[PDB]
């Protein structure tokens, strides 16, 4: 049985899907993410060397669905439209589950074939794994600004980058305390 168990089960009708998703899609999409042995486990997940892999995947769809709810608070449909340009000369727009933009996530490998497709959940929550097992692993830590430079999903993620707001102060408390990590 799960021990930890995302938040998006509690809000969402789909979310149990969601996390069926999920799991499948870290084995996929993440695997160097559940490979790597964060330098800031410390200040997120204490006991984070001693999980197996199993709980890796429940650690990271629980900290994907902290990040979802600071930025869409569960809401696919979410469309933010950003003040800078892209490749066509057109503001970007920010969709779906975690915020992402087609040309952005399309550098990843995410393959959105559609502006409609990032409003898929689990298309966007595919696409959010390949950023993390991207910087998470390049980096080797979760999040943070060393020396000058954001890391790990602080690289994309506004909501991962360390501040004295609620968005941050939580994704934190809440990863620090889960069972598996105290």
């Not at 969402?12 to 486990?41: C, E, F, M, Q």
């Not at 990032?118 to 910087?135: E, K, T």
């Amino acid at each position: 049985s799960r021990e930890v168990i995302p938040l998006w089960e509690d809000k969402v009708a789909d979310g149990k899907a969601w996390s069926t998703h999920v799991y499948s899609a870290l084995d996929k999409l993440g695997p160097n993410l559940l490979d790597v042995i964060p330098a800031d486990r410390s200040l997120f997940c204490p006991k984070y060397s001693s999980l197996s892999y199993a709980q890796r995947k429940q650690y990271w769809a629980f900290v994907l669905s902290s990040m979802v709810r600071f930025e869409s608070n569960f809401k696919t449909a979410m469309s933010y439209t950003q003040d800078f340009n892209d490749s066509n000369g057109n503001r970007v727009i920010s969709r779906g589950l975690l915020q992402i933009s087609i040309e952005s996530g399309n550098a990843y490998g995410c393959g959105f074939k559609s502006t409609k497709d990032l409003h898929d959940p689990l298309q966007n929550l595919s696409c959010g794994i390949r950023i993390l097992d991207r910087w998470v692993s390049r980096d080797g830590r979760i999040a943070g600004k060393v020396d000058g430079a954001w890391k790990g999903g602080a690289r994309y993620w506004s909501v991962l980058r360390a501040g004295d707001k609620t968005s941050y102060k939580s994704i934190v408390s809440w990863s620090q305390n889960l069972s598996i990590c105290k």
